[PDB]
Design a protein around this nucleic acid. Structure first.
Lengths: 380, 96
RNA sequence: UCUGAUGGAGGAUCGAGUUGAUACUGACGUGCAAAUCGUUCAUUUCAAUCACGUUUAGGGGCGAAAGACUAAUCGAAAAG
RNA sequence: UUGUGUUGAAGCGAAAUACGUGAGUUUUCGUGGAACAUCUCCCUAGUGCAGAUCUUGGUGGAAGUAGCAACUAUUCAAAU
RNA sequence: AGCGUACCAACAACCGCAUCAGGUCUCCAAGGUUAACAGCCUCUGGUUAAAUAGAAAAAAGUAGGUAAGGGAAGUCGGCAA
RNA sequence: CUUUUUCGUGAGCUGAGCUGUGAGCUAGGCAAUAGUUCUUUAACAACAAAAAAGAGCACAAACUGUAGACGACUUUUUUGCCUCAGGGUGCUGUAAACAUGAAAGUAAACUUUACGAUCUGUUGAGGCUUAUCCCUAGUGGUAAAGUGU
């Protein structure tokens, strides 16, 4: 018979199967739709989760209970060392999907990039990419001309530089960033120009821009149904334990449906979360990257004592409003919005007054070690 | 055939262990560390070192122990591990 | 009559042990166990508890009475 | 009645250009090591099994699985 | 005079089909705290043994702890705590 | 097969000559035979032997913990990593020792000496701080080289 009381199902069937992700790196399922009118531009970037802090910003929402008051918001720090463009991939449309016409490479690739092709780089003689890079310039131009003639989707292969981060990993994460913009000719020229140089975050993203974040959630091994799906605990009197689903299906159909929550892997899931706003693109060069006009102190983004479980952010970074899936050190793919947003949140010009740099270990009271030593005075 | 003086931080080795297994775990880790460092399978711990590790009962072994490893010739190679009584542990690094 | 002591009665009280077994309708339920384990609970000067000896034997015994018990067998034991 | 056996009987394993419609019969090779038929006709019976939660014995998949969980706790060195 | 006199008495020597967490009568009874032969710790005596060990340590189970604000709204029932 | 020859393509040679190849022209003589059929052994692809010519990784191990029941997964293996130490950052809350130091008071000598919970100074001290915190070409170390192709 029917349920006595109706309540919505536990969890979303749109994130099935809740299995471990195939890879650690976040993978773009689909790039933003190409607009021919816009000039050629990159559409994605990769960084690493460093940690979280909180900022103070003045609200400019008329008719809101906050409005002219200053509020505190949590933010995520993603260290974004400049990416390196090393390749070009041409895609053409077929009834079977997108087909690679060819990928051409730059004249030189770094050992960091080459390490990604090796499971044991230390004991190998590192012969990868050693003789295919001497291809003639005429053949390169032939392949590029054929790409221009027959391809409709252009992607640039670019890789991270983990040596610029505190990561123990040395092999670079390499991905394809789709070039969206003008004609095929303009796209090819745009990528050819920076076929070998660094790609900083600032050329891909602007401040106060909404982006999507693609990453892999924090792993938790196999978890019970209570934690994995949020089902209600059975009463204390339950004979064979209470942390489970009581009825896993009616008599008929004489099977267990795939919609029934069960114990299994929780976390380490691929997730694409939309509409994270860039609050600040902090440059590596300037020493006041964490300073504001209302603070005028000289301090960088890294909290005193370092970012817990990550290290020190010594490179370009961006301050994302809110939270982002993954652990510290996790590679995080930043993607441009699939369609540009015209909402007031997306277009708002953020004016942040204070960026916290107190110790994230324990309850830090000071923003800088200099302030700490000044407050305490001389010791033994 | 060499002699080494090392400090072992037993706190981080017994950090995840039950109350009832802290001292035996410390002893097992000392044996494993000495074997790995000296590349010998025959590791003999001094009874005085055992006494020092167990001096505070099974609950809490010392956080750090300063120890002397010695390779001796009589498969053939083996190593003695001996306690080194020290007033303090600060500034004490690995020695050979 | 009232007050303070003294005194030490009671099928009096709490409570270990003993003797039991209220609840978790806990564990176990291919058990440690053909009735156990844990916590909780009842009981302790009396109709109290225990041992050995001795009496009562099957349409019989014995029963502060549940058709209870009478050698894992009881609305008629067990053996042939 | 009239036959086969140490120049290898019964039994058993695999078989056969074999016979029969079929129950079966008959042969070959191997093993075996001492008995065996009689279809010439007849007499006799404790005479024919897939089952009976059949009887006795042996053996499986389950399965290298459940499990080897009370009683706080072991460690170093030596001897045999 | 004759008979018994070893040993166990359960913790594996008894009865429970067993080297079974069960059952099975009696005597002796230290110190501290304390009302106390209670509980907890200790001296003499005994033991460090239990049908296994090592590692890892998630789900789930079982035996416990602790939980903001509310305080029986839970449940047949304040069962359990 | 020989003879007379014409037109198109490949090797080498200098738009061009020669050889070969395919088709053709004139003339000649030269073969088939297995007893009546038993699939008309005729295709494609592969393989083996013999001749002639051109032509590296992964696992394991140690480490890691962005992972984990076990597998699996993320890493590093000599500007790395592990280790200890120093520093940073925190947590706790002022260590041990000493003090004609204090201390409610007490007793014991011819004004000092003993007992004293506790308190004070040295002392924001001492202890701990990655094992899944941060920094350091700081110390010491970084091991046998096994398995598959």
């Amino acid at each position: 018979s029917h349920r006595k009381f109706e309540r919505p199902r536990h969890g979303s069937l749109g994130f099935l199967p809740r299995k471990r992700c195939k890879r650690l790196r976040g993978k773009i399922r689909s790039f933003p739709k190409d607009d021919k009118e816009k000039p050629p531009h990159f559409t994605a970037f990769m960084g690493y989760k460093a940690g979280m802090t909180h900022i103070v910003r003045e609200v400019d929402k008329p008719g809101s209970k906050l409005h002219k008051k200053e509020i505190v918001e949590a933010c995520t720090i993603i260290e974004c060392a400049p990416m390196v463009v090393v390749g070009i991939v041409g895609y053409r449309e077929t009834p079977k999907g997108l087909r690679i016409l060819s990928t051409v490479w730059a004249n030189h690739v770094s050992d960091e990039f080459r390490r990604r092709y090796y499971k044991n780089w230390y004991k190998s003689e590192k012969k990868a990419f050693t003789k295919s890079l001497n291809v003639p310039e005429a053949t390169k131009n032939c392949l590029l001309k054929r790409i221009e003639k027959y391809c409709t989707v252009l992607r640039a292969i670019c890789h991270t530089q983990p040596s610029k981060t505190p990561l123990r990993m040395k092999k670079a994460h390499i991905m394809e960033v789709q070039i969206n913009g003008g004609s095929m000719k303009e796209k090819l020229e745009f990528v050819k120009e920076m076929l070998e140089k660094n790609l900083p975050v600032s050329t891909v993203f602007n401040p106060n821009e909404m982006i999507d974040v693609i990453s892999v959630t924090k792993g938790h091994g196999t978890k019970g149904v209570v934690s994995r799906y949020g089902v209600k605990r059975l009463p204390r009197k339950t004979h064979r334990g209470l942390r489970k689903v009581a009825c896993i299906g009616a008599w008929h159909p004489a099977r267990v449906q795939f919609q029934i929550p069960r114990h299994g892997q929780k976390g380490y899931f691929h997730r694409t979360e939309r509409n994270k706003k860039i609050y600040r693109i902090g440059l590596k060069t300037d020493k006041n990257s964490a300073s504001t006009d209302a603070d005028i102190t000289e301090k960088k983004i890294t909290p005193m004592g370092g970012f817990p479980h990550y290290g020190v952010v010594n490179e370009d970074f961006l301050l994302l409003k809110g939270c982002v899936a993954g652990t510290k050190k996790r590679p995080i793919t930043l993607r441009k919005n699939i369609v540009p947003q015209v909402s007031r949140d997306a277009l708002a010009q953020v004016s942040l007054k204070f960026i916290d740099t107190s110790s994230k270990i324990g309850h830090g009271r000071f923003q800088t070690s200099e302030e700490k030593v000044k407050y305490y005075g001389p010791l033994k | 055939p060499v002699t080494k003086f090392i400090t072992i931080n037993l706190s981080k080795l017994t950090h995840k262990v039950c109350y009832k297994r802290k001292a035996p775990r410390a002893i097992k880790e000392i044996r494993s560390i000495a074997g790995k460092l000296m590349h010998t399978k025959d590791v003999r711990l001094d009874v005085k070192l055992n006494k020092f590790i167990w001096s505070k009962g099974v609950r809490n072994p010392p956080k750090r122990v300063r120890v002397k490893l010695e390779r001796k010739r009589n498969e053939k190679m083996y190593t003695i591990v001996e306690h080194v009584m020290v007033d303090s542990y600060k500034g004490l690094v690995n020695e050979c």
